[model samples]
Target: SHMYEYPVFSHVQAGMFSPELRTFTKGDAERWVSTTKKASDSAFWLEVEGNSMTTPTSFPDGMLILVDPEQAVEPGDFCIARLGGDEFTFKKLIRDSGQVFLQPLNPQYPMIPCNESCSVVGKVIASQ
Candidate 1:
């Protein structure tokens, strides 16, 4: 069922892997997959886009970013999110009292506030 998700996001790239067992997202209840100790064995994805997330001053235009959905999201993590119902926003998720913040990489852009699961999808593990 894996189609060409790359045309819009570009090719694929899997990032850091660990020996530990990590629980990642897999829709509602389709079942999750585990990883081995090998790095190459890790399964990940990537998305290519404009300067929406390239750290504003750091990210160039039309860059491709590698992602690892299973790579846990901490306080400060570069994440790709489907905000609201259909809008998309790339920024760091700052959480406080169950409130999530949609932060832009560039200073030119301002951060938005998101409440609970309405703000986060999966954290980006790495970028190309």
Candidate 2:
């Protein structure tokens, strides 16, 4: 009962840049969930939507993932990224030859280039 509370937002809502801009508030959340981690002010929860990041090792669909915008994203970090047209994607961050890319754990999906319009909203800190 003493766990910290974090807001849960949809993938679309998370991609809106409100969370990235620090404009999102608890009042705007779809619901609030408790977490054992002491997440930051910009931290929020997102339900895994698809199989893009799904693998035998981790990240299945419908799992709740905690996103922390304040966390610095590095290579091999699982992150919530905003792509062109405000599309949101959850994937592993990869850097190859100085080019940043979003890689899906599932081989069925193609890796995306982190272009000028694409930005990382946050890195996934925890999941349940």
TM-score of each: 0.53, 0.79
Best by lDDT: 2
* Global lDDT scores for all candidate models: 0.47, 0.76
Give the per-residue lDDT digits (tens) of candidate 1, residues 26-52.
Answer: 343232333232222233443343454
Off by over 4 Å in 1: 1-48, 54-57, 95-99
Clashing pairs in 2: none
Model 2 TM-score is: 0.79
lDDT of 2 at 108: 73
Tens digits of per-residue lDDT, candidate 2, 23-105, equal 23344666888889887898989876666667764777778889999999999899988766456778889997888998888
- Candidate 1 has its poorest 10 consecutive residues by lDDT at 13-22
Off by over 4 Å in 2: 12-27
